[PDB]
Amino acid sequence: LNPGQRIIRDMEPVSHRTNRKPFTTGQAYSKIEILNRTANMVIDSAAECSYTVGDKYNIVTYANGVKTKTLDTLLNVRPNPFMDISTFRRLVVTDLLFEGCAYIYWDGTSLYHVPAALMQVEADANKFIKKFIFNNQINYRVDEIIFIKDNSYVCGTNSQISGQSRVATVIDSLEKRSKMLNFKEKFLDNGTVIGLILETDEILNKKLRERKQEELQLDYNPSTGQSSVLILDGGMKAKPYSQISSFKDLDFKEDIEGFNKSICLAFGVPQVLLDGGNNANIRPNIELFYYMTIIPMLNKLTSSLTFFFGYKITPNTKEVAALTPDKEAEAKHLTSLVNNGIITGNEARSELNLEPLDDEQMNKIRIPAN
Amino acid sequence: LNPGQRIIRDMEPVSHRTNRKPFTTGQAYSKIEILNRTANMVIDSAAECSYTVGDKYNIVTYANGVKTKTLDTLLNVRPNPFMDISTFRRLVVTDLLFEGCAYIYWDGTSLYHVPAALMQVEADANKFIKKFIFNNQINYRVDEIIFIKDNSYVCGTNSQISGQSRVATVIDSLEKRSKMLNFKEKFLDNGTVIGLILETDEILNKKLRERKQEELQLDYNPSTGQSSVLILDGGMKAKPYSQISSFKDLDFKEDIEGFNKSICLAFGVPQVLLDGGNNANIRPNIELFYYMTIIPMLNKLTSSLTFFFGYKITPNTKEVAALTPDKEAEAKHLTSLVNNGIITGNEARSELNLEPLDDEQMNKIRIPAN
Amino acid sequence: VIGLILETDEILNKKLRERKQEELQLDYNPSTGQSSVLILDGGMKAKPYSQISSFKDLDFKEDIEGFNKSICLAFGVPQVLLDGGNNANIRPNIELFYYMT
């Protein structure tokens, strides 16, 4: 046991909600299209990757007596007798994203989801965590909650608990982008556009002055008029005016592009995926996105699962439509291994997502020799 | 024993925390998003690399009697009876990053984590280190704590104690970038936009003047108007004004890009990882990131581990999704090695992350000979 | 940073002058205002001022890049290692760094 755990409790007795302003985040996700699309692709991608359970670690875990097949079916087919697999996975991933942490309940035989927007974790004076408090009055325990924590540095010191919300960091950038974009719309709806100013030093009958004003407006526009010369009489003067604040000054494109690139940067999506990319970009960018962004996100979940159940669980995609291996190269390398005897044919079948055959000559290596 | 160790202790009796301002760093991590993404990539990438324990060094280390398999389980499956593997690695790496150093406690059988933001190291007049003081009154020892130090040159002389926090070098750049970015939104919300400036040397009825100023603004906006000509009567003049301080002057984009490269440079992540890259950019840049940045960072940890336990521990990834070898090239070199008899087939499978199979012909080198 | 410089050759009650200054500031900003034309009465003029020392003059970026290259030069680290490199850039530069430095 850790002799310094009680000081850890004293320095942070309870978890801290990190999505400091939730309503602004919800408003932006609802009515801002870069956050909407980026969060949607991240969550949907973290919902397509299947989980493959491995061997049993001969250790004591919080959940014991669960067989491999039951865990596999509840984790890849249907978690709860009442809820979907993709819905539950998306809920967990969106809790991990929009909130710092993500929480999953564990019944006797079913694996329920609990939102992290209301749960608060209370540290223990002795071990690691005393008891979770969902909103209030729940008081789950610890053996029945799967804890997913995204790394955080909140307040002075990092925390054994809680988590820092990825979406909560882009709120300032989203507000800046929205204000900067609304400024152009209001500038267009407000700024005045004129084509000609005439001046006279004597008052000339406001009614008739206005009538001549619309006469000049309609008559000297090539779409609706067929005149191009003015003969000003009586000393009326034409002031050579200029435009005060032209639209060319408001060059917000570069700043808006910077804000968009930053927002795509925080979630981790490459900018090429949202745009159109060449053949040299699409496959490497899909690989970079999925692996280096999502697979940490799912690795947190799978590590928490292998802590909770003791079964080695890893994010093994091998089936997502975005990372389907190149058929020619994959076939070439699998055939090379099969011919040269490194792997059996059945393993190649398993890699090709086929089903192994109960054949004799395939279950043993070829060993070409001669 | 070192004759000069007492002078070393006299020149620096105790360690000193190097993250001089923790709260500003926390607020930057929580509300500045380039820093969030860079730190998250570094920490998560430093949490995916598995650890392989090698042989036993016949030396007297601080931890004795620990079995190889028990150390492997503690270091790759479950460090604690109460906390995860990914969470533990993430805490250790974020302590190494945001603070200068990182500390890991060691019970008889459990390998607990302790924060480095609170704990101070006291040098020894004779050997190396008297003890470790966690805030106070705990007073761990040295025989039971694992010490991971990031190289530092603080004050006049470099220290065998303490350490330099990489993030603390970035706070000034973060403040500069935040101020520079806030200046643009404040300039937009504060600057004035004018369409016309009409003057008269005599007073024209403020109420009716304001009514005409609303009518004249709404009438000459082509979105909401059907007039474009002015007939100024009574001697009212139109001053040919010009915009005083246009927005085109504030060319902050290059400065903000410089500050973004500022933020990313200190952590070590290449700028291509954040953006999109070609076939020739993604995998080489991920290789640079992992190797050059992370693997020294985990090499500090593994060197401290091999000091503590005496077992050769190295960061052996071989499984991280972002460094999966090219299937075709990997197949080609493995098959060539197997055919030409340099390595056995079983160790080829081992390098393929599969399970070696107990065969008679495969356990020996093929020896092509003819 | 200034938007307007309106001038008057007579004194006009500092308190209300400041009040109208604030009102005309807030009114003629499209973000927080819904007006774009200004009618000046009483002989008040509008001086066509200009920006004295614009931020565009301070082009420090090239000098700052030179200083960064100079700092990275003394230690020996190639500039490609810190940035992103292609297949042709990255491994020869890692080799040059390790070996030569």
Swiss-Prot record, chains A, B:
Cellular component terms per the entry's GO annotation: host cell cytoplasm; viral capsid
InterPro entries: Phage/GTA_portal
Cellular compartments annotated: Virion
Presence of the UniProt keyword Metal-binding in the record: no
Keywords carried by this UniProt record: Capsid protein, Late protein, Viral capsid assembly, Viral genome ejection through host cell envelope, Viral genome packaging, Viral long flexible tail ejection system, Viral penetration into host cytoplasm, Viral release from host cell, Virion, Virus entry into host cell
Coiled-coil blocks: none
BP-aspect Gene Ontology terms: cytoplasmic icosahedral capsid assembly; symbiont genome ejection through host cell envelope, long flexible tail mechanism
Family: Belongs to the phage portal family.
Functional description taken from the UniProt entry: Forms the portal vertex of the capsid and plays a role in governing correct capsid geometry. This portal plays critical roles in capsid assembly, genome packaging, head completion protein attachment, and genome ejection. The portal protein multimerizes as a single ring-shaped homododecamer arranged around a central channel. Binds to the terminase subunits to form the packaging machine.
Quaternary assembly: Homododecamer. Interacts with the major capsid protein.
Name the UniProt record assigns to this protein: Portal protein
Species of the source: Escherichia phage T5 (Enterobacteria phage T5)
